[PDB]
Amino acid sequence: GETTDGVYRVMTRRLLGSTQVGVGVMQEGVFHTMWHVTKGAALRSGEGRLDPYWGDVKQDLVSYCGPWKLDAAWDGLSEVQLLAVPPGERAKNIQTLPGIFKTKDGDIGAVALDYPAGTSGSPILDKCGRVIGLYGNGVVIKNGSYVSAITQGKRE
C-alpha cells in the first residue's frame, strides 16, 4: 500500500456509503491510530494489508506494521495545533493552549475542541511539527462539549 508519512483517514463500507470512523498517523512505515477507531482489526492500503503490531485498550492506542514510533511530549507551556481531519472535509490545523487532565497517576495535556467522533486519531503537533499525541480519548464536560486528552504512546 501507500507508506508515505503523513495523516490518513480511516474508512469503512460496513455502513451506508463510505463512512469515516477515524484518522491516523503514518511515520517510519508504522500506522498509528486510537484503539476505539479500529478495535484492533487489520486495514487495507490499496491492495496492501496493514496488520496490528501493538495495542492497549487502556491507553486507547494501536500501531500497525511496527512498534509505536511517536515519542514527542507537550512541554506543559506552549500552544499546540490539532491537525483535524473531519469526515468529508479537508485537513485543517486548529491552534489551542491545552488544559490539564488531573489523575491519581499524573497530569495529562487536554484539548477543548468539539469535532465529530470520526475525527478520532487526528494528530496534535508541537512548534517543530512533531506528533505529541492523538485526539479523540476524553470526556463530555459541564457544557456538553467534548474535551480530549493528548494521548501519547511509549517508544521502545
Binding site: 480511516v10 496493514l50 495545533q81 470526556v139 474535551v147
Partner: protein, 39 residues
Amino acid sequence: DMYIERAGDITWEKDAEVTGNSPRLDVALDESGDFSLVE
C-alpha cells in the same frame, strides 16, 4: 474491511485558526480506557 486514504502532510502552519479554552479537569481512567469527571 477498513481502509486508509492519505489526507495531508504533518506540518506546523503559521496563522492557523486559534480557538478552544484550557480547562483544568479532575478525571479518572477506567480499565476500558474511558475517562470520567471526578467532582
